[PDB]
Design a protein around this motif. Structure first.
Motif, PDB file in Angstrom:
ATOM      1  N   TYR B  97       0.793  -1.286   0.187  1.00  0.00           N
ATOM      2  CA  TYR B  97      -0.046  -0.023   0.024  1.00  0.00           C
ATOM      3  C   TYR B  97       0.807   1.173   0.110  1.00  0.00           C
ATOM      4  O   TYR B  97       1.807   1.340   0.862  1.00  0.00           O
ATOM      5  CB  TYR B  97      -0.918  -0.019   1.092  1.00  0.00           C
ATOM      6  CG  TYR B  97      -1.546   1.340   1.251  1.00  0.00           C
ATOM      7  CD1 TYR B  97      -2.629   1.766   0.390  1.00  0.00           C
ATOM      8  CD2 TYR B  97      -1.656   2.151   2.298  1.00  0.00           C
ATOM      9  CE1 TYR B  97      -3.469   2.671   0.502  1.00  0.00           C
ATOM     10  CE2 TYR B  97      -2.423   3.116   2.337  1.00  0.00           C
ATOM     11  CZ  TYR B  97      -3.199   3.658   1.343  1.00  0.00           C
ATOM     12  OH  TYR B  97      -4.041   4.782   1.392  1.00  0.00           O
ATOM     13  N   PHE B 136       1.692  -4.873   4.177  1.00  0.00           N
ATOM     14  CA  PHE B 136       0.734  -5.221   5.178  1.00  0.00           C
ATOM     15  C   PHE B 136      -0.006  -6.737   4.775  1.00  0.00           C
ATOM     16  O   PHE B 136       0.277  -7.420   3.626  1.00  0.00           O
ATOM     17  CB  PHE B 136      -0.456  -4.244   5.166  1.00  0.00           C
ATOM     18  CG  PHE B 136      -1.154  -4.398   4.051  1.00  0.00           C
ATOM     19  CD1 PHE B 136      -0.960  -3.647   2.865  1.00  0.00           C
ATOM     20  CD2 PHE B 136      -2.548  -5.132   3.762  1.00  0.00           C
ATOM     21  CE1 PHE B 136      -2.016  -3.701   1.609  1.00  0.00           C
ATOM     22  CE2 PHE B 136      -3.465  -4.972   2.844  1.00  0.00           C
ATOM     23  CZ  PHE B 136      -3.151  -4.315   1.693  1.00  0.00           C
ATOM     24  N   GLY B 139      -5.690  -8.573   8.351  1.00  0.00           N
ATOM     25  CA  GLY B 139      -5.735  -8.448   9.677  1.00  0.00           C
ATOM     26  C   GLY B 139      -4.544  -7.563  10.496  1.00  0.00           C
ATOM     27  O   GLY B 139      -4.543  -7.717  11.580  1.00  0.00           O
ATOM     28  N   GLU B 140      -3.531  -7.151   9.867  1.00  0.00           N
ATOM     29  CA  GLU B 140      -2.340  -6.619  10.219  1.00  0.00           C
ATOM     30  C   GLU B 140      -2.837  -5.176  10.861  1.00  0.00           C
ATOM     31  O   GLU B 140      -3.724  -4.524  10.444  1.00  0.00           O
ATOM     32  CB  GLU B 140      -1.412  -6.316   9.215  1.00  0.00           C
ATOM     33  CG  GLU B 140      -0.139  -7.353   9.463  1.00  0.00           C
ATOM     34  CD  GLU B 140       1.288  -6.772   8.868  1.00  0.00           C
ATOM     35  OE1 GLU B 140       1.520  -5.470   9.155  1.00  0.00           O
ATOM     36  OE2 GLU B 140       1.883  -7.524   7.911  1.00  0.00           O
ATOM     37  N   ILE B 142      -1.798  -1.588  11.823  1.00  0.00           N
ATOM     38  CA  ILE B 142      -0.818  -0.802  11.357  1.00  0.00           C
ATOM     39  C   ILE B 142      -0.738   0.191  12.275  1.00  0.00           C
ATOM     40  O   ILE B 142      -1.716   0.694  12.999  1.00  0.00           O
ATOM     41  CB  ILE B 142      -1.251  -0.335   9.931  1.00  0.00           C
ATOM     42  CG1 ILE B 142      -1.649  -1.444   9.111  1.00  0.00           C
ATOM     43  CG2 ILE B 142       0.198   0.434   9.443  1.00  0.00           C
ATOM     44  CD1 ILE B 142      -0.630  -2.641   8.824  1.00  0.00           C
ATOM     45  N   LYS B 144      -0.893   4.021  13.649  1.00  0.00           N
ATOM     46  CA  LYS B 144      -1.490   5.282  13.280  1.00  0.00           C
ATOM     47  C   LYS B 144      -0.728   6.047  12.917  1.00  0.00           C
ATOM     48  O   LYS B 144      -0.936   6.918  11.793  1.00  0.00           O
ATOM     49  CB  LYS B 144      -2.452   5.745  14.502  1.00  0.00           C
TER      50      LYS B 144
END
Lengths: 570, 562, 561
Positions: B97, B136, B139-140, B142, B144
């Motif tokens: 991403y 990623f 369900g990882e 990350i 904020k």
């Protein structure tokens, strides 16, 4: 020609990658030699974006188009945005390579079912992308006619059969929130599919989204259009994340995949949306909700190309919905209520201020202000009766600055610190405030016409121990007592002030515990404060403490296990 | 908290500033399994609007004028479209991403009193973008901080640039246009297109498409009456055939791929090609005009330092230019536009006698050509007007007619030989067949009919090729313009048997004394004449010629003694 | 110095010419430490105008007209935007400088008298550019030759192109559109986009974007009355569905990276896709129209020769075409636009009987389809009008209605069987697919009596004659018909006047069969019939199926003795 579907009319999608008969070489071909790279591309807009209809007596052009656009991707709206595709190939040394371009289509069919048979079938060909077919030749080499000429329509990919019959404890404060729920959202039933590119082994293929038309199609849904309209949601998004451009974009995204020399692969490109939620969290429940899907910069799926000859399993179209292909995200940004007054204190608070409540007439309102220097401030009201709530403007003080005066940065993105949105609760806030930063105090909706005052005072004493917590002022007769307030989030604080019911230096049996919530409490006796204990866990504690009669004590509680929206104390 | 004296200053915090809360508002791309994601943008209309944060001591006009006086003029620069792109590839069986941002140049107007900042204004000029990527899994969770920024920060290392608010040329007389090199820039980042921070394993490019063809040349002169801007452009057209000054169609683009263990930054600049128009007269520069034609850019690639280093407050450099391209000096003489060009239409075969018309004492050119290659002696009546022969650079490569002069309208000339003087001389020079040649007749002071004579040299006079012979009083020192190194100068004199010592001053020349009998015979060879004390027995009442080849050029003038 | 006879000649000195003193007047790029520098330009408007150098005998009009008559028409070519790009990477810890130039095609108009050039005109037509690079250090003294050019030169090797200025087709009768291949170009560089000289270790690209979509097809015909340009385009639409003539949206681009050891030159051309519209009648081509649809380009990659070699003066080649693409021949029969198309709306199940109307004696088509796949015998009254069955290529792949004909308006047809020879008794035995559309061309009759077309499904022994036309036979002997293509079939039906009967053909090789007559029983198998001397009841019907193996003659001849 036999189906298992019940009698009626169905909308059928045969998928992308369809090539039409006899129109193989009519776009042209490139010849390359001796290590040259041949790149052939096209842009899908205007004439090469016109669907081809094959109507039937029972299914006319309108009947096909309306049903196809109701269930599957709206091609009429999609065909107005130019989309580019490219194919790249390199010729080996001392060899001649020929490649010719085609157009790929999405085959939609309207079928009529009677006695488990297709008695009528309509066809629609929506142009999606292209396909480059290459070969290596030598002078006088006899090429197979199948390489040049196609007799019947075929799917370069594997065909499909999609049919449809035609007939958590949030410890938030009261107010508005805008939540970034993630990126890479798409829609079911290929409603956002830009197109599929079949890349032969040893070649390259790219799907390009240039900004020939600077226009997007945001999707919006709300539960209360009277309050949460589309314009209201866009204004709140601008307040929270400073989003400016909704239906217009200038960013360009492009996906490029190079196929390995051993296998054929296909790539699928989609249009993505960035999900936003505007909520109205009140008294512990969501009252209003509005979903806003700002168009994102696309999503590419790369998979090995399956055999064009494979079992076709007839499938029902999935229910309309969204799929998130990006990473998990949840950013919560509180926003200022636009239906409330924002008052300002232009001169920065130094050590003592006494704001006079004006033009408000019992309505709730904000007080924008700043402090002269960093310190712990106790903020209260007359007799503590209106319980205030302090916020912080996210990203204030990073810009224009004037010493000793407030600089209204006009930031509506707020961060809750402490305070209760409860009527008739005596409390004062002990908070650490930073220099030059803008802070909001939401005065609650009062019911009295008496002149009220907001007081600010620097804590140059033992009261600094209660930093970033709101102190409840308590009523006592010994016996059973309970106090219910909104539970602060984990690692946050809540303070209590109480008196033991005649000062003599006379003790009492006092039990301290909470309900449904775990917090490592602390006890200070009074103004100078001295510590009595350190690690009172108050989940369901049965401990008893000798308490001097007619003395003031303070109970600081640090919430560790948030099990309930409310916190109860005995 | 400051070291500056009391007053108002203009502060540049540098490029690479990102703004709070607007991280993801442009969109993000998701890629998987070996795909390449390319994200870009173009800065023109709304991407190029500066954001002002004024104070009740300065103004939006007060900010903009002071910023644009010292630093880059963003108003005139934001109107030219500039493109940037970021490229990233996802590894196999994994999801990548990336989301786009905008970078800004933070300018500040600060007020200093008792060594403290009492007031600070802020301006954010948009420059380029920044792509931030992550890998990623479904369900990882990350961080904020990857998604959200709370306070403004510099992705690069911040800076603090403040300013308080309050040689022997052996040239002939005439005009020259000098290409002094390419890649010129201006100090204090006045030409910086933008900075791209490329993370390790990704690519970043800065693109200059010609969506708008407007360019902004810079020009300065010492005499606007004579060397105006239009005059300088006309002379540039005469010399190097430069046609487009304010317009360009060429596209330039810089692409850098970051190594997988370093995240690095690239800086792109707008470049200029320096031109000088000079009026070299009697050994000194009288006029000078500097023209900076816009070039095709300059990229500087450096490893990105930690966004957190010691910020050393710096004073802005003085106004000036830096050359980042290679060293260059091309000198091209140009035809004086304020002088008449006469022509000899029939090519000179063996003998011509030009009649001076009309031109009564103004200097003028005689454009001509010869029928075949040979050594021609060119003189005037009694040799009184000292002529100077030039060559049109690149003549005869094109249209041709046998036995006639074909005008090429080439004003780029190359000096060969001749004096800028009231001095008896004739030119011995080798002329090519189809080439066009100029003979500048000097400003005379008489009304009598003069003539220019051309004669082909088939005799021993061919030894004096590409030299001008001084005719000599002597019944002793002679001063002339010194020819450049490896060039020649000839002297002709008559002896009044005697003792003759010939030497020069400040210049070393290889004498090749010949005797005239017209026949030429070589008497002495390799006479080095730099303060030479040698002597030669010289026959009385005989004509002698001394060819001198300039070897060491220390003085503008050549001196010779008897 | 010349060898040409006395007169006026047009001369091409080739591409790659750079002009004096205009070296770094377009600008230069500086890169450092692993950066990639890409410099490009687009050939249009001003950098597209030629430079004329006229002479008293050759003026600007004379030069332009003579150049454009023999060589590439630059006026038409300069109106289409063409882009070129050069890419270079700087090595680590080093500075690279590169500057852009423009390259030209040098044309000359020369006059020759007594074996010498007494007059010469020059024209410089713009083409792509040239990037020259160097690696420099601070204070490095660069040679003036790198920056400055004194005289015009060719970066490539110069050329001297002068001109003095003053097979058994077994087709059925009808129209065909033949794709003869792609990558066609024209001689004498009439389609050359331009040449890029790429220095070692750099990249060069020739780009054809679509800023102007105009393309320029070339057309030639032998009979403009029938085969006009519009007629040819309509037939191309019928055959291959070619929609966009003289307009294209496709983008093509050639990129070559030069090895660090060699200089590389690349030539880009504009290509055409050759189409032929023919009118094949009675075995000979009667009409022909050649259409060259503009295609995506052709790139030729070769090692750069030394810019200095013997300049052999050459005569320009005769005007023509060269194919640089692969060999192709796709033959697609098209429906005659000058004939009526009748329709049978209800699909044939087992028995139909069409009544021939509006058509008078003119030949016409019958578009129809069958209810289910089967072998149908199609005849016409007493077999007098010999029908010919066709198949619409790509029918049944789209809209469908059970039990009714769905018109697809496909004029691309595929011949199956039938004789285009009136006054010949025949009926067709053919296998027809369910949803496919089929054409029956009724020949031009001469009688006014109402005739009928009959369709009958064959569920008997007649299925052995599938995809063949049976000749009905006098015989109280030689018979000539159009020979079917190799692996195809032709059938003969005759009555014996027992007796000794010899079966053989002329000029053609065919495996025969002798089914005896309704029930059919195999009698003879694998009878090879070219000049065969083999031999065999009385007053009985026999059928002669013939499978063409070797096609030497347009006509098939059969002898019965």
């Amino acid at each position: 020609d036999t189906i298992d579907l019940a009698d009626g009319n169905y909308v059928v999608s045969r998928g992308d990658g369809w090539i039409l008969s006899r129109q193989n070489q009519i776009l042209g071909g490139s010849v390359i030699s001796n290590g040259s790279t041949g790149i052939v591309g096209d842009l899908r807009v205007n004439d090469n974006a016109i669907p081809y209809y094959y109507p039937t007596p029972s299914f006319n052009e309108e009947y096909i188009k309306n049903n196809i656009q109701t269930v599957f991707a709206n091609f009429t709206e999609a065909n107005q945005i130019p989309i580019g595709f490219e194919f790249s190939k390199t010729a080996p040394s001392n060899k001649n390579l020929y490649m010719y371009l085609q157009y790929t289509y999405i085959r939609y069919e309207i079928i009529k079912v009677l006695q488990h048979e297709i008695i009528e079938r309509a066809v629609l060909y929506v142009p999606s992308l292209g396909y480059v077919k290459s070969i290596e030749f030598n002078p006088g080499e006899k090429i197979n006619k199948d390489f040049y000429f196609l007799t019947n329509d075929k799917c370069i990919l594997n065909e499909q059969f999609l049919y449809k019959k035609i007939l958590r404890v949030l410890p938030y404060s009261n107010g508005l929130y805008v939540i970034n729920k993630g990126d890479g959202y798409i829609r079911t039933n290929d409603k956002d599919l830009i197109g599929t590119l079949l890349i032969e082994a040893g070649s390259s293929g790219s799907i390009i989204q240039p900004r020939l038309r600077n226009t997007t199609r945001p999707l919006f849904t709300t539960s209360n259009d009277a309050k949460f309209s589309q314009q209201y949601t866009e204004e709140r998004l601008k307040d929270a994340f400073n989003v400016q451009l909704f239906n217009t974009s200038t960013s360009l995204f492009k996906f490029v995949e190079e196929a390995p020399s051993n296998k054929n692969i296909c790539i699928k490109a989609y249009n993505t949306y960035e999900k936003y939620e505007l909520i109205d969290y009140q008294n512990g429940s969501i009252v209003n909700k509005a979903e806003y899907y700002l168009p994102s910069l696309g999503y590419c799926e790369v998979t090995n190309a399956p055999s064009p000859e494979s079992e076709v399993v007839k499938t029902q179209v999935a229910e309309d919905g969204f799929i998130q292909n990006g990473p998990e995200e949840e950013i919560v940004v509180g926003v200022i209520d636009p239906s409330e007054n924002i008052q300002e204190i232009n001169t920065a608070i130094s050590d003592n201020y006494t704001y006079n409540i004006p033009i408000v007439n019992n309505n709730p309102f904000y007080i924008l202000f700043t402090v002269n220097t960093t310190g712990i401030y106790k903020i209260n009201a007359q007799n503590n009766l209106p319980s205030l709530k302090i916020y912080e403007a996210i990203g204030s003080g990073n810009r224009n600055f004037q010493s000793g005066n407030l600089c209204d940065d006009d930031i509506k993105a707020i961060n809750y610190i402490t305070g209760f949105d409860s009527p008739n609760a005596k409390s004062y806030l002990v908070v650490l405030l930073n220099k030059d930063k803008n802070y909001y105090i939401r005065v609650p909706q009062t019911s009295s016409n008496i002149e009220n005052q907001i007081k600010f005072k620097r804590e140059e004493g033992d009261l600094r121990n209660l930093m970033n917590s709101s102190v409840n002022i308590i009523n006592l007769n010994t016996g059973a007592h309970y106090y219910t307030r909104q539970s602060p989030d984990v690692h946050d604080y809540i303070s209590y002030e109480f008196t033991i019911p005649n000062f003599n230096n006379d003790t009492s049996n006092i039990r301290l515990y909470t309900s449904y919530n775990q917090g490592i409490g602390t006890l200070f006796r009074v103004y100078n404060l001295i510590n009595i204990q350190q690690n009172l866990n108050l989940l369901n504690s049965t401990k008893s403490i000798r308490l001097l009669n007619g003395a003031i004590y303070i109970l600081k509680v640090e919430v560790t296990e948030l099990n309930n929206y409310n916190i109860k104390l005995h």
